[PDB]
Amino acid sequence: MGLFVHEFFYSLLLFDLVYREETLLNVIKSVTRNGRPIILTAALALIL
């Protein structure tokens, strides 16, 4: 998506390079592991 392909994206590559950073990955984790059925605890309020 910049070979000859349109604008943007470049942004996407930046996002994943920073993801490849771990420590931020550790803090990122501070939101998925006990989160995989806790996206379901969102709809609690969305129903409440």
Binding site: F8, S11, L12, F15
Partner: peptide
């Protein structure tokens, strides 16, 4: 946040005149 600027901005130009 920085991407979802664009994700809006592509399908929706800001369409802003006054606050």
């Amino acid at each position: 946040v920085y991407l979802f600027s664009i994700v809006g901005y592509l399908f929706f130009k800001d369409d802003f005149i006054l606050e």
